[PDB]
Each structure stands twice: as C-alpha cells, then as structure tokens.
Design a binder for this molecule. Structure first.
Ligand SMILES: Nc1cc(-c2ccccc2)no1
Ligand SMILES: [Mg+2]
Lengths: 151, 151
C-alpha cells in the first residue's frame, strides 16, 4: 500500500472507532469530510485546530456541554481542520421531520459541496450520512466503513 | 508588537482562560510547556495532536472520563504537541503530602528539564506550577500570568 493509502486507512479507522463510541453513548456528532470542493469558508467559521486525526480527539471534541461540541468538525485529508463550524441548513422536504439541526446542517453542506458528512443522533444513537443532498439513515457499522472506503 | 510577540501573548491568554475555567470546575489538568530541554521522548508516549492552541481545545482535552484527559498535555513551538502523555513521578520528599500523582508528575518532569508545568487540582481547583524541582502552590491568576510571561 502507498503511504497515502495507509494514511487514509488509519484516518478511516479513527473516524469509525469514534463514531461507534459516540453512537453507543448517544453523543451527538456532526463530522464533515472535505473532498474536491473546498470548504474554507465554513472552516473559517470554527475554532482552528489543524490537528492530527485520532479517535480520541474526535470523541473529546463532541462531549456534551463542552466548548467544542456544538457545530461541525470539518476534516481535510488526514487532519481535523476546525471544530464548532457553521454549515448551512437544508430546506429539503426529504429530511425526516423528527430530525434536528445537525442533520439539516449536514444535508445543507452536502447540497453545495461533494463532501461526506456523518451525523450521530443524540436521540437514538443512529448514524447517518449526507452526500449530494441525500440523507442515508440507520447505518450499520459495516455500511459506514464501506461508504468511507469508497469515498 | 512583532508577530512573534503577538503570538506568544495569544497563547498565554488561551492558557490562562483554560486554566481559569478548569480551576472553577475543579477539573484536574496537567500542562507542560517544553523549553530548551527537548521532551520528544515524553511527547511520543501520548496521542499526537500537533494542534493550534485554543482555550476551547485545552478545556475539551481535560474533561474527566474522556479519552484524552489522563496524562499530560505537552506544548512545543506554540502548538499542542500531544495529550495523555507520561511524565516521570518525582520521589521528592518535600512535596505537600496531600498532593497526588498529577502534582508528582509535574515536579518529576521539572527535575529533569527546564520546562514549566501548570497543574489544576481536581480536589480543590488550586493552580500550581512546577519548575526546577519545586512546586509553587495556590497561585492567583496574576501570579500564573507573571510566571508565563517570565518564562
Ligand atoms: N464542562 C464539563 C465539566 C465536566 C465534568 C464532569 C465530571 C467532573 C468534572 C467536570 N463535564 O463537562
Ligand atoms: Mg434503512
């Protein structure tokens, strides 16, 4: 595997471990992975980290009632660029009515970028992904990992 | 002020804001600032971050019962190098006997480096600094700022 490919695999393992930990504990989370559409305008709204990825840091960011937990984490390649970032709210009618602002923000950024956003529901622990204006809910651990590997 | 001086002051303000919040909430914390003696061997025991300093990230790191809260944060070159790092425990018989391992770790690293370590007590919220093998206890906010500026 090339170093780039190994680094990607490590980042995916770190994300999936953090998401699984948060889902089990009903820690709401909103994590956008920048792809080819640059997200600088949204990164600049948050608190800069420019930090190496780890499952530990991802989990620490989203702990309820802490400075960094409200808003989106935006990742650039193998780094956490910023936390507590603004994303635009979607008005799509295909967002389940019971869902709150994290899911609407995720679909919103997915309408104007090619990013992949993962959401953990604080109500149910369900994991969802927003991409290209669509929300895919109730993902298994295996499905999330496959989606990330394909991305 | 020059860019380097403005950056140093921003970091001092971020540190003091985090320490003040943790003192108020009696959140135990251990934060070592590397100086001329390299601390790479201790940095390598922790979770790599290489993150920009912010008061928000410092607070999020030390929240109890989280992945990153157990061990020292080590700062280097105006960044958070790593969290959850090992520091050596002092065997000094001249540390106040009611203090536990966080304070002994701070004194211990200060015995073998020129670093400055800040400790927040989880028992009292008291703020102390270890340097040169001595622990300076029960600091006011002004006293901590003076130490950081002198350092
Ligand atoms: N801001 C914040 C503080 C805490 C906490 C929890 C247990 C013990 C001490 C502090 N959790 O979130
Ligand atoms: Mg389904």
């Amino acid at each position: 595997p090339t170093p780039v490919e190994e680094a990607q695999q490590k980042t995916i393992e770190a994300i999936t471990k953090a998401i699984n930990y948060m889902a089990k504990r009903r820690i709401g989370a909103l994590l956008t992975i920048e792809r080819d559409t640059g997200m600088g305008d949204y990164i600049e709204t948050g608190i800069p980290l420019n930090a190496k990825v780890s499952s530990e840091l991802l989990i620490n960011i989203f702990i309820p009632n802490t400075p960094l937990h409200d808003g989106a984490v935006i990742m650039k390649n193998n780094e956490i660029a910023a936390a507590a970032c603004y994303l635009p709210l979607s008005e799509s009618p295909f967002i389940s009515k019971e869902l709150g602002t994290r899911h609407r923000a995720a679909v919103g950024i997915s309408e104007v970028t090619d990013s992949l956003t993962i959401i953990v529901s604080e109500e149910t622990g369900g994991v969802s992904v927003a991409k290209n204006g669509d929300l895919h809910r109730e993902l298994t651990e295996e499905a999330l990992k496959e989606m990330l590997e394909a991305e």
